[PDB]
Amino acid sequence: WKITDEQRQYYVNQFKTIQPDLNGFIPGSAAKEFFTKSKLPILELSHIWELSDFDKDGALTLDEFCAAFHLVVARKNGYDLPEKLPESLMPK
Ligand SMILES: [Ca+2]
């Protein structure tokens, strides 16, 4: 795993429309749609959100965003990812 500052800007350049800085929160609805817009079906988008939404507040912060976009990119051009998020048995 790794991230390039050059890339982080790429997302913000556009996402800035909704997520300007690490002081922003995107509702799962926006993420679902925004990401869905890319290609991956909402079905998959679920996994991305859960993984990117370490807090599970139904809101994605610039960070959740950064990881989400990056992770999504990989899901599209990388390797198969795991699945720690249990269907109905979250470690809580
Ligand atoms: Ca969150």
Rg of the chain (C-alpha set): 13
In sign, the C-alpha dihedral spanning 52, 54, 59, 65 is negative
Between the CA of 85 and the centroid of ligand 1 the distance, in Å, is: 14
5 has binding-site annotation: no
Return the DSSP state at 39: S
Q: By what technique were these coordinates determined?
A: NMR
Query: Residue 8 has which token pair?
Result: 């982080």
Pairwise CA distance, residues 9 & 15, whole Å: 9
90 contacts: CB under 8 Å, gap ≥ 6: 56
Residues in contact with 64: Cβ distance below 8 Å, sequence separation at least 6, in sequence order: 26, 52, 53, 54, 55
Q: Which two tokens stand for residue 23?
A: 């002081």
Q: What is the CATH number of the domain that holds 7?
A: 1.10.238.10
Q: Which helix (H) or strand (E) element contains residue 47?
A: helix 42-52
Chain-centroid distance of CA 28 in Å reads 10
How many whole angstroms from 65 Cα to the centroid of ligand 1? 9
For residue 4, which amino acid is it? T
Locate 46 and state its tokens.
């679920």
Cα–ligand 1 centroid distance for 58 (angstroms):
6
35 within 8 A of 72, measured Cβ to Cβ: yes
Query: Does 57 show up as a binding residue in the annotation?
Result: yes
Q: Alpha-carbon distance 91 to 84, whole Å?
A: 10
Number of domains in the chain: 1
**Does the annotation place 80 within a ligand binding site?**
no
Domain span at residue 28?
A: 1-92
21 is in an annotated binding site: no
